[PDB]
């Protein structure tokens, strides 16, 4: 017998500021590190950038009306720090706050719960210029001041808050892979930045207990649960290594305030462990969240990787390497499609940390065709979303406390580096990589599917 | 490059009182449940029982002299409750205590650390007759009074203590499988007895913090780490269920004072969850151990098990079933041999609980041939031990705090149900299932191997 979705289950959809808003230099907004990075020649596909994106800044009333048509219970968005503090620190921009106040009012006039994301990768460029943003302890207090501003303005009306969204991605892409700002490839720097981000998350949760005492807050982690390839002992050991180094390295700090030891000793053997200050442990341990946010797309299977092995497959010599999983389907971009992996991840979080879970992001990106009569038949997206939602209900039945599900994304949006054509939305936006066209919003088949899921609280999938 | 073993590493060997002592009715000893059970005809191979065993109660001086020849750093043994309280509660038997005092002094006179194990399966029969032993809450205070007696007598001289040894074995074999006393096959009763044993363990740990404030204590768990068969999502899910149900069910209680929730909810759905009294959680949560004891022989591989499936393979329908692992070796008794599995289990306990580990038992059971000139060439036992010790060194290199390693067993001993021929000792005892012969002690080749391990602190294996 499956348990129903609970009565206040947050059936949601989500976006990120840079990906949807546009209005990059309007109303006193300052430059973000992504405004500057995306304009560097060659960094983004076809030079696409967030100057306009899908123009949600100007079109938010129409987008919220579509959310109310769907009957969304929640909408998760991020606040652009550069709209609120153009220089990161210094003077507050009231026009920037007023946008978010208007959005929040629009949502709440339509019965939709705002879920505010403090940070989605868009630190103001002035903090990078002054002190290298996330590589300086200065950002702890600067981020805290920005979060407290939002808690004071909006805490009366927003219950659910996410802090750092996918820290593991903005830190590893920014400092290890060099794919995101600041374009660094230096693992020592990455781990230092990562440690400062940890401190900044904990500081803001501490502040939130003061200013929003009836609210709920947590970080959101980009979680790819690890699988061993098989029951070969060395492959299971590779999975122990991978799960700790890729996943526990973040989530243990969020839940328990401590880094896992094996991974710490591995980094210390490489001279990569972060610099720890007095007070750091006590801060990290005293900032327990209300939930773990999870951004989920796929699992990762791993196998043994010898000390001269792989650094197709990626890994850490002597720790693990990735291997294709022969037992799941793949998307056209070679991501696994693994809905049972979402149940697995959910079970692992409850079993390890006993935390409730907000699923902050899950979705399917695909080329969608706009057919005559403004029809998009994205049954491939319905099938993927269906399967995941089915597995969530199984995890709830097992005993996981799932607070809600935010499908990625509400409208189509700009990808960070790959332009617009791999689409994620319930709502098609008429534009492409060459121009904004008319930016018209067109409901996809999946829109109506999810409207029906919500209406029936997930009895009709 | 491997780290060395730590300088104070406890190279050990172990036994259990029923399996070694004999002297079943001497010096006021009362009946244990095993004295009674093993005399039931047909229960044990060739009617073998503990009346004499290997006669360690009379031959302890010789045995300890051999330990000192080997250079053992630690000797782990169990105390027979029925020697100390013949009726379980009631009057203390000084002559019982005196045997352990004489053993302890022998150890100490030869520079060997005693590791006292409170409980190895031998509750006095009188408690079983009085109130059903582990099925009654009365045993919590009776066990505590027994423990406290030992702490008071020996706490000055014994630093390391183990509480319940292999609770998961005595409880499951006694109440689910009906292989051990009290010969019951009832899961409801099993979980209730298990709950009471958890409270007993936590009560004694609290007591220890008063009586032996500079000591180290913990329970010892019979740990078979689970592996998924492959990377099929449903097999990984089966692993999740199996690790939780078979392993976390005990070790989360020991470390955290909490049962895991998915398994709890499954048992509650079946009417199997234990009865919880006011005060039980607070007690379980306030009795943190210094270390996790681990008895290790093999890993277990699992796969998906349909709701109309297995309850050869064993399992829980809808949760998991066991499967032979084609990737590990086997003894001549078809026990799997999986040394890497020890490293995995070690890694998992440090990763989950951040506890130091005492390996309380690990060894190879095999027929040994006694050659003329009192020669026993057991290179098979050397190979098995060596491989496991090598994996412990890798675990220590990874960052696991391993306190020591107690090889199973110091002398050959009586098995619970299978007599004497599958031998585990470094020291052969000349007796068999039909005859006590002369009970003479013969050093095996493995004796000398281990001697050399200890002399070099594990650098020469
Ligand atoms: O002689 P046997 O029957 O090989 O017994 C060996 C030792 O077994 C240890 O416990 C085992 C138990 O025998 C298994 O059936 C069970 O599944 O595993 C546990 C794992 O610890 C006992 O610890 C010991 O007292 C026996 O000598
Ligand atoms: O378009 P891509 O490159 O598949 O990116 C999809 C998504 O990737 C996720 O990691 C990010 O959360 C989003 O912010 C983004 O839309």
Euclidean distance between CA atoms A346 and A391, whole angstroms? 10
Residue B310, both tokens? 């297995």
Of A233, A325, A339, Cβ closest to residue B341 = A233
Angle between helices B379-398 and B339-353 (to 10 degrees): 30
Which residues of A fall within a CB distance of 8 Å from B229?
230-231
The DSSP string of B137-202 is: THHHHHHHHHHHHHHHHHTTT--EEEEEESHHHHHHHHHTS-SSTT----HHHHHHHHHHHHHHHH
Nearest C-alpha neighbor of A101 from the set A52, A50, A149, A51: A149
- Nearest-CA distance from B167 to chain A in Å? 22
Give whole-number Cα distances, B58 to B27, B262, B414, in Å. Answer: 12, 50, 16
Distance from the CA of A444 to the center of ligand 2, in angstroms?
19
A77 forms beta bridges with A116
Backbone angles phi and psi of B220, in degrees to 5 = -120, 130
Tell me whether the omega of the peptide bond preceding residue B379 falls within 30 degrees of 0, making it cis: no
Residues of A in CB contact (< 8 Å) with B are 227-234, 236-237, 240, 244, 248, 258, 260-262, 264-266, 299, 301, 325-328, 338-341, 343-344, 347-348, 350-352, 354, 398-400
Residue A331, both tokens? 């998307």
Q: Give yes or no for a contact between A218 and A163, defined as CB atoms under 8 angstroms apart.
A: yes
The DSSP string of B207-247 is: HHHHH-TT-EEEEEEE---EEESBS-HHHHHHHHHHHIIII
For tokens 């991020």, the residue is A78
For tokens 């006393």, the residue is B181
> Is A236–B344 a contact, with Cβ atoms under 8 angstroms apart?
yes
Q: Give yes or no for a contact between B352 and B312, defined as CB atoms under 8 angstroms apart.
A: no
Q: Give yes or no for a contact between B20 and B54, defined as CB atoms under 8 angstroms apart.
A: yes
Residue B195, both tokens? 């709950």
Spell out the domain ranges in chain A. Answer: 1-461
- What is the number of residues in chain B? 461
Q: Is A230 exposed, middle or buried (0-12, 13-18, 19+ CB in 10 A)?
A: buried
Euclidean distance between CA atoms A146 and A85, whole angstroms? 7
Q: Is A369 exposed, middle or buried (0-12, 13-18, 19+ CB in 10 A)?
A: exposed
For tokens 């339509």, the residue is A110
Residues of B in CB contact (< 8 Å) with A are 227-234, 236-237, 240, 244, 248, 258, 260-262, 264-265, 299, 301, 325-328, 338-341, 343-344, 347-348, 350-352, 354, 398-400
Nearest C-alpha neighbor of B431 from the set B418, B413, B448, B447: B413
Q: Give yes or no for a contact between A385 and A379, defined as CB atoms under 8 angstroms apart.
A: no
> Is A248–B351 a contact, with Cβ atoms under 8 angstroms apart?
yes
Backbone angles phi and psi of A45, in degrees to 5 = -65, 125
Residue A453, both tokens? 């899921």
| B458 conformational bin, left if phi > 0, alpha if psi -120 to 50, beta if neither | left
Q: Give yes or no for a contact between A340 and B234, defined as CB atoms under 8 angstroms apart.
A: yes
Q: Give yes or no for a contact between B359 and B396, defined as CB atoms under 8 angstroms apart.
A: no
> Is B351–A232 a contact, with Cβ atoms under 8 angstroms apart?
no
Within chain B, how many helices (H) and strands (E) appear? 16, 16
> Is A347–B237 a contact, with Cβ atoms under 8 angstroms apart?
yes
Parallel, antiparallel, or unpaired for β A441-443 and A427-429?
Answer: antiparallel
The topology (CATH level 3) of A1-461 is TIM Barrel (3.20.20)
For tokens 């009569």, the residue is A373
Nearest C-alpha neighbor of B318 from the set B331, B333, B302: B302
B334 forms beta bridges with none
Ligand nearest to the backbone CA of B53: 1
In which element (H, E) is residue B68 found? Answer: helix B56-70
- What is the number of residues in chain A? 461
Ligand nearest to the backbone CA of A34: 2
Residue A9, both tokens? 């289950």
A79 forms beta bridges with none
- Closest-CA residue, ligand 2 atom 13, reads A415
Cα torsion at B359, B360, B366, B369 (round to 10°)? 110
Residue among B360, B416, B423 to mutate when testing ligand 1 (max atoms within 8 A of CB): B416
- Nearest-CA distance from B239 to chain A in Å? 10
Cβ neighbours of residue B456 closer than 8 Å, sequence gap 6 or more:
none
> Is B236–A229 a contact, with Cβ atoms under 8 angstroms apart?
no
- Nearest-CA distance from A344 to chain B in Å? 6
B226 forms beta bridges with B300
Euclidean distance between CA atoms B68 and A353, whole angstroms? 46
Euclidean distance between CA atoms A170 and B286, whole angstroms? 40
Nearest C-alpha neighbor of A416 from the set A35, A126, A28, A67: A35
For tokens 């001993």, the residue is B413
Experimental method: X-ray
Cβ neighbours of residue A252 closer than 8 Å, sequence gap 6 or more:
A258, A259, A260
For tokens 């002398």, the residue is B411
Whether B365 is in the pocket of ligand 1, judged by its Cβ within 6 Å, is: yes
Angle between helices A56-70 and A94-109 (to 10 degrees): 20
In which element (H, E) is residue B115 found? Answer: strand B113-119
Parallel, antiparallel, or unpaired for β B315-316 and B320-323?
Answer: antiparallel
> Is A237–B340 a contact, with Cβ atoms under 8 angstroms apart?
yes
- HEC per residue, chain A: CCCCCCCCCEEEEECCHHHHCCCCCCCCCCCEHHHHHHCCCCCCHHHCCCCCCCCHHHHHHHHHHHHHHHCCCEEEEECCHHHHCCCCCCCCCHHHHHHHHHHHHHHHHCCCEEEEEEECCCCEHHHHHHHCHHHCCHHHHHHHHHHHHHHHHHCCCCCEEEEEECHHHHHHHHHCCCCCCCCCCCHHHHHHHHHHHHHHHHHHHHHHHHHCCCCEEEEEEECCCEEECECCHHHHHHHHHHHHHHHHHHHHHHHHCCCCHHHHHHHHHCCCCCCCCCCHHHHHHCCCCCCEEEECCCCEEEECCCCCCCCCCCEECCCEEEECCCCCEECCCCCEECHHHHHHHHHHHHHHHCCCEEEEECCCCECCCCECCCECCCHHHHHHHHHHHHHHHHHHHHCCCEEEEEEECCECCCCCCCCCCCECCCEEECCCCCCCCCCCEEECHHHHHHHHHHHCCCCCC
**How many C-beta atoms surround the C-beta of residue B307 within 10 A?**
7
A99 forms beta bridges with none
For tokens 């290594």, the residue is A241
Query: In Å, how far from its chain's centre is CA B218?
Result: 12
Euclidean distance between CA atoms A397 and B72, whole angstroms? 52
Backbone angles phi and psi of B422, in degrees to 5 = -85, 95
Nearest C-alpha neighbor of B454 from the set B68, B31, B155: B68
For tokens 């490059």, the residue is B1
Residue A191, both tokens? 């781990």
Euclidean distance between CA atoms B376 and B370, whole angstroms? 5
- Closest-CA residue, ligand 1 atom 12, reads B169
Q: Give yes or no for a contact between A196 and A137, defined as CB atoms under 8 angstroms apart.
A: yes
For tokens 């203590």, the residue is B161
Ligand nearest to the backbone CA of B366: 1
Distance from the CA of A240 to the center of ligand 1, in angstroms?
27
DSSP-assigned letter for residue B441? E
In a mutagenesis test of the A interface, which of B229, B233, B234 is the best target, namely the one with the most A β-carbons within 10 Å?
B233
Euclidean distance between CA atoms A190 and A273, whole angstroms? 10
Euclidean distance between CA atoms A54 and B234, whole angstroms? 40
Euclidean distance between CA atoms A390 and A340, whole angstroms? 9
Tell me whether the omega of the peptide bond preceding residue A409 falls within 30 degrees of 0, making it cis: yes
Give the N- to C-terminal CA distance of chain B in Å, as an integer.
Answer: 16
Nearest C-alpha neighbor of B291 from the set B409, B156, B406, B457: B406
Distance from the CA of A297 to the center of ligand 2, in angstroms?
10
Parallel, antiparallel, or unpaired for β A113-119 and A160-165?
Answer: parallel
Q: Give yes or no for a contact between B251 and B234, defined as CB atoms under 8 angstroms apart.
A: no
Residue B97, both tokens? 């205590």
Tell me whether the omega of the peptide bond preceding residue A24 falls within 30 degrees of 0, making it cis: no
Which residues of A fall within a CB distance of 8 Å from B261?
350-351, 354, 399
- Closest-CA residue, ligand 1 atom 26, reads B415
Ligand nearest to the backbone CA of B34: 1
Collapsed DSSP state (helix, strand, coil) of residue B102: helix
Distance from the CA of B223 to the center of ligand 1, in angstroms?
12
Nearest ligand 2 atom to the CA of A365 is 4
- Nearest-CA distance from A271 to chain B in Å? 15
Q: Give yes or no for a contact between B241 and B262, defined as CB atoms under 8 angstroms apart.
A: yes
Residue A288, both tokens? 């327990």
Angle at B72 between CA B66 and CA B73, to 5 degrees: 150
Cβ neighbours of residue A268 closer than 8 Å, sequence gap 6 or more:
none
DSSP-assigned letter for residue B418? T
Q: Is B419 exposed, middle or buried (0-12, 13-18, 19+ CB in 10 A)?
A: middle
| Resolution of the structure in the document, Å | 1.4
Give the N- to C-terminal CA distance of chain A in Å, as an integer.
Answer: 17
Whether B222 is in the pocket of ligand 1, judged by its Cβ within 6 Å, is: yes
């Amino acid at each position: 017998h499956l348990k129903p979705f609970p009565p206040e289950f947050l059936w949601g959809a989500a976006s990120a500021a840079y990906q949807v808003e546009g209005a990059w230099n309007e109303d006193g907004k300052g430059l973000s590190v992504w405004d500057v990075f995306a304009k560097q020649p060659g960094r983004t596909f076809k030079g696409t950038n967030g100057d306009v994106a899908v123009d949600h800044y100007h079109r938010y009333q129409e987008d919220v009306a579509l959310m109310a048509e769907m009957g969304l219970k929640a909408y998760r968005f991020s606040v652009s720090w550069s709209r609120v503090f153009p220089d990161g620190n210094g003077a507050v921009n009231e026009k920037g706050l007023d946008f978010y106040d208007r959005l929040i009012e629009e949502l709440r006039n339509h019965g939709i719960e705002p879920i505010v994301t403090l940070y989605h990768w868009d630190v103001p460029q002035a903090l990078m210029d002054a002190y290298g943003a996330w590589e300086s302890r200065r950002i702890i207090d600067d981020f805290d001041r920005y979060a407290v501003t939002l808690f004071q303005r909006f805490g009366d009306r927003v219950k659910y808050w996410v802090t750092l969204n996918q820290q593991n991605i903005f830190i590893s892409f920014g400092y290890r892979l060099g794919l995101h700002p600041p374009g660094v490839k230096d693992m020592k720097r990455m781990y230092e930045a990562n440690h400062i981000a940890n401190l900044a998350n904990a500081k803001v949760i501490q502040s939130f207990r003061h200013y929003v005492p009836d609210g709920k807050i947590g970080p959101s982690f980009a979680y790819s649960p690890m699988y061993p390839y098989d029951s070969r002992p060395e492959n299971v050991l590779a999975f122990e290594n991978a799960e700790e180094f890729q996943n526990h390295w973040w989530m243990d700090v969020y839940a328990w305030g401590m880094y896992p030891q094996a991974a710490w000793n591995y980094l210390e053997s490489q001279g990569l462990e972060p610099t720890v200050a007095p007070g750091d442990w006590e801060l990290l341990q005293a900032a327990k969240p209300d939930f773990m946010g999870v951004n989920y797309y796929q699992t990762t299977t791993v196998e043994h990787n010898p000390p001269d092995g792989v650094g197709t497959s990626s890994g850490i010599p002597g720790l693990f390497k990735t291997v294709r999983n022969p037992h799941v389907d793949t998307t056209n971009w070679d991501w696994a499609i693994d809905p049972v992996g979402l149940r697995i991840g959910l079970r692992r979080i409850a079993n390890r940390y006993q935390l409730p879970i907000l699923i902050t992001e899950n979705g399917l990106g695909e080329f969608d065709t706009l057919e005559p009569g403004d029809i998009v038949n994205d049954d491939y997206r319905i099938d993927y979303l269906r399967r995941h939602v089915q597995e969530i209900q199984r995890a709830i039945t097992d005993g996981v406390d799932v607070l809600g599900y935010c499908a990625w994304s509400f409208t189509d949006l700009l990808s960070w580096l790959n332009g617009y054509q791999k689409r994620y939305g319930f709502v098609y936006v008429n534009r492409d990589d060459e121009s904004e066209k008319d930016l018209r919003r067109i409901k996809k088949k999946s829109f109506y599917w999810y409207q029906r899921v919500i209406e029936t609280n997930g009895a009709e999938l």
